[PDB]
Design a protein around this ligand. Structure first.
Ligand SMILES: Nc1nc2c(ncn2[C@@H]2O[C@H](COP(=O)(O)OP(=O)(O)O)[C@@H](OP(=O)(O)O)[C@H]2O)c(=O)[nH]1
Ligand SMILES: C[C@H]1CCC/C=C/[C@@H]2C[C@H](O)C[C@H]2[C@H](O)/C=C/C(=O)O1
Ligand SMILES: [Mg+2]
Ligand SMILES: [Zn+2]
Lengths: 179, 191
């Protein structure tokens, strides 16, 4: 019985909630979603276009949003950012060379007017790696203490084991019931 | 007959390609069955004999310098004259399987757009307009026809999404409506 879905069991038949998940390539997004679907596969009829990776618990959905590509296409994203209550930002905490690139991507998503009210959950992923930055270090490198008017949380995770996923989503669930 | 051997080494060159596009090109180049220029690799991909379209798409979607040159040359081999945008896109997306990563689709749509505009001058005011609209059509196909998307975009939303992309202004509603209808009623065919 899906442990993660049970976290959101009592929202209030409230209205669909939508969470977007963003992060650089290789941060761990696909891996997290495999855990949130509990490893269950389907043969899906193919579709030409973007990979869509989503998990729906009903009353709540989590969708990976690929930020790759040029800036000229970003105006097109705007209506999809419209009904978003939360953003999960996943970072490869072992990738010290790309942490500033991750910070800049986060900061551009957080300047989308359409996301003004979204809560932010940061997964500082890949904590199992021996030279990983921990949550306190990631918090500094992402500049999270300079955020204002934003409800945010950072959670240390290892996506391959699932460790930390429950605790970050539990934080998220409590934010979404409180509004 | 010194030639059947050529067929064996070609069939071997194509399967390897289907398993691993880079290795199959290297094998074909090494055995003097294919010229290692972007132009000749592109013709080879475009003719696509015995080639898996997923492997062609994966090769064209790579970011190495040679692959970028091949993608350019590949798109130059397409003739889009007197096609509307969707018809041109259907032809283009029939010749390879589009990758799913946005960085790859973006690069492919810009390249497509440059060629579309050359073949059909004055249909768009700028290649940027063609590029952004083509990308929004790929988005629309995905939205409408991928079952992981539950709340499907309607015409009004599709029209609202493309606001401002005509060099800061709008394209005509009927042009967007005809694109919308073509994709809704006939998704991009799976190769
Ligand atoms: N050590 C470690 N690795 C992780 C962790 N999370 C994801 N990974 C690995 O990192 C690679 C990228 O993950 P993926 O989930 O595809 O990233 P993405 O969808 O954000 O691009 C995968 O390895 P591959 O490409 O080898 O399959 C995945 O197994 C983690 O917590 N710890
Ligand atoms: C809700 C579905 C809508 C499908 C069309 C959206 C495509 C986005 C375009 C963006 O550049 C990358 C894709 C981005 O990754 C969208 C993921 C996705 O699941 O979106
Ligand atoms: Mg992924
Ligand atoms: Zn050219």
């Amino acid at each position: 019985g899906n442990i993660f879905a049970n976290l959101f069991k009592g929202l209030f038949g409230k209205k669909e909630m939508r969470i977007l998940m963003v992060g650089l390539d290789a941060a761990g997004k696909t891996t997290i979603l495999y855990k949130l679907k509990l490893g269950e596969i389907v043969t899906t009829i193919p579709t030409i276009g973007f990979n869509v990776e989503t998990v729906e618990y009903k009353n709540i959905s989590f969708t990976v949003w690929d930020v790759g590509g040029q800036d000229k296409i970003r105006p097109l994203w705007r209506h999809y950012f419209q009904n978003t209550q939360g953003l999960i930002f996943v970072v490869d905490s072992n990738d010290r060379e790309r942490v500033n690139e991750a910070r800049e991507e986060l900061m551009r998503m957080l300047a989308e007017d359409e996301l003004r009210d979204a809560v932010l959950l940061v997964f500082a992923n890949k904590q199992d790696l021996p030279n990983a930055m921990n949550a306190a270090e990631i918090t500094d490198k992402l500049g999270l203490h300079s955020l204002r008017h934003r409800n945010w949380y950072i959670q240390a995770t290892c996506a391959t084991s699932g460790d930390g996923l429950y605790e970050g989503l539990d934080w998220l669930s409590n934010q979404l019931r409180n509004q | 007959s010194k030639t059947l051997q050529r067929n064996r080494k070609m069939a071997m060159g194509r399967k390897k390609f289907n398993m691993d596009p880079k290795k199959g090109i290297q094998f074909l180049v090494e055995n003097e069955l294919l010229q290692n220029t972007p132009e000749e690799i592109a013709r080879f991909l475009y003719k696509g004999e015995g080639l898996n379209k997923t492997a062609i798409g994966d090769y064209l979607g790579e970011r190495e310098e040679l692959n970028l040159a091949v993608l350019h040359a590949f798109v130059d081999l397409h003739e889009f004259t007197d096609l509307n945008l969707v018809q041109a896109l259907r032809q283009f997306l029939w010749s390879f399987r589009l990758p799913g990563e946005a960085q790859k689709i973006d690069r492919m749509m810009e390249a497509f757009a440059q060629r579309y505009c050359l073949c059909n001058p004055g249909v768009f005011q700028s290649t940027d307009t063609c590029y952004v609209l083509s990308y929004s059509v790929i988005m629309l196909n995905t939205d409408l026809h991928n079952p992981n998307v539950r709340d499907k975009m309607g015409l009004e939303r599709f029209v609202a999404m493309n606001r401002g992309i005509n060099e800061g202004g709008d394209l005509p509603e009927e042009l967007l409506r005809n694109l919308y209808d073509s994709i809704r009623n006939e998704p991009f065919k799976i190769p």
